[PDB]
Enzyme design. Structure first.
Site, PDB file in Angstrom:
ATOM      1  CG  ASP A 133      -1.979   1.130   1.109  1.00  0.00           C
ATOM      2  OD1 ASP A 133      -2.047   1.803   0.058  1.00  0.00           O
ATOM      3  OD2 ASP A 133      -2.700   1.350   2.106  1.00  0.00           O
ATOM      4  NE  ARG A 137      -3.552   5.380   1.499  1.00  0.00           N
ATOM      5  CZ  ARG A 137      -3.580   5.293   0.176  1.00  0.00           C
ATOM      6  NH1 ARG A 137      -3.575   6.373  -0.587  1.00  0.00           N
ATOM      7  NH2 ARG A 137      -3.604   4.092  -0.393  1.00  0.00           N
ATOM      8  CG  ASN A 138       0.312   3.952   4.009  1.00  0.00           C
ATOM      9  OD1 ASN A 138      -0.192   4.234   5.096  1.00  0.00           O
ATOM     10  ND2 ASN A 138      -0.289   3.166   3.121  1.00  0.00           N
ATOM     11  CG  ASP A 151       1.847   1.957   9.233  1.00  0.00           C
ATOM     12  OD1 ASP A 151       2.682   1.736  10.138  1.00  0.00           O
ATOM     13  OD2 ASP A 151       0.851   2.686   9.402  1.00  0.00           O
TER      14      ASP A 151
END
Ligand SMILES: NC(=O)c1ncc(N2CCCCC2)nc1Nc1ccc(C2CCNCC2)cc1
Ligand SMILES: [Cl-]
Length: 270
Positions: A133, A137-138, A151
């Site tokens: 992912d 945003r990560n 993450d």
């Protein structure tokens, strides 16, 4: 300890100092460990995470170590909810950082943000570890402006079905290659595709990809051959790099080692 000794961390050694916001699994707080060391404290909302599977995989992530990977320090599993303790990144989420126009970024800074992420991704690739992912945003940003990938792999333990159904409202449609949206074929090459979109995010100062299209329209169009336009801040040579990540055939996409070489080549011209 904190990156040393036990990775079951005693909650009594933790002090909660400020709310940081929420992420995939809920609340995130800033704290100190033993009064000395900054930590981020992820409080895992019950029912949001496949916790047994994560804790087993956490043994694997404890053994990954790289400057541009957000460090996992340990877990607090002897309470409700469980906590995940990680490296503290004082400038927060990359996506929000990029959208703050006061920073007045140079493209030299943007390019180094890409190198930061690419270095973490090459390391994960060298460990045959998919992120699954990858997106702005990560990623997180520390007090020195360094970008680090966070993450990695955690999507595997997300129980919210809107996040894991390819047609769910929360699936990373805009970061997924056609073989993922069409056949659920994840590979290192679907990470490569996502990195290309992440590069576009950075050079677009955090605009949302395909913002004029819904998720379903995006999946249809990228499958036909529609591609993100060159951001105004990206030179042709930079755009060729992100663009190479979106080849229709997975095996025609580069590796992260090649992408890193390509980014460094551009940096070396400055
Ligand atoms: N490991 C970490 O440090 C960390 N991990 C996850 C996470 N969040 C919250 C945001 C969404 C994703 C999960 N935040 C984190 N730190 C963090 C640090 C500072 C801010 C402020 C600083 C002022 N300007 C920006 C806001 C926000 C978040
Ligand atoms: Cl577009």
């Amino acid at each position: 300890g904190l990156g040393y000794g036990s990775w079951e961390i005693d909650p009594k050694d933790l002090t909660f100092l400020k709310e940081l916001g929420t992420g995939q699994f809920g609340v995130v707080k800033y704290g100190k460990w033993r009064g000395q060391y900054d930590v981020a404290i992820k409080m895992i909302k019950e029912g949001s995470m496949s916790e047994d599977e994560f804790i087993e995989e956490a043994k694997v992530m404890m053994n990954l170590s790289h400057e541009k990977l957000v460090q996992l320090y340990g877990v607090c599993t002897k309470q409700r909810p469980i906590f995940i303790i990680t490296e503290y990144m004082a400038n927060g989420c990359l996506l929000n950082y990029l959208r703050e126009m006061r920073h007045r970024f140079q493209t030299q800074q943007l390019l180094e943000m890409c190198k930061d992420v690419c270095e973490a991704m090459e390391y994960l690739e060298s460990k045959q570890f998919l992120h699954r992912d990858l997106a702005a945003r990560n990623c997180l940003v520390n007090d020195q402006g360094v970008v680090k990938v966070s993450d990695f792999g955690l999507s595997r333990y997300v129980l919210d079905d809107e996040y894991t159904s390819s047609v769910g409202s929360k699936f990373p449609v805009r970061w997924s290659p056609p073989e993922v949206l069409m056949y659920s074929k994840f590979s290192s090459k679907s990470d490569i595709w996502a990195f290309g979109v992440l590069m576009w995010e950075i050079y677009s100062l955090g605009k949302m990809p395909y913002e004029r299209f819904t998720n379903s329209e995006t999946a249809e169009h990228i499958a036909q051959g529609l591609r993100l336009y060159r951001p105004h801040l990206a030179s042709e040579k930079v755009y060729t790099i992100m663009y190479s990540c979106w080849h229709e055939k997975a095996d025609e996409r580069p590796t992260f080692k090649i992408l890193l070489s390509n980014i460094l080549d551009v940096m070396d011209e400055e």
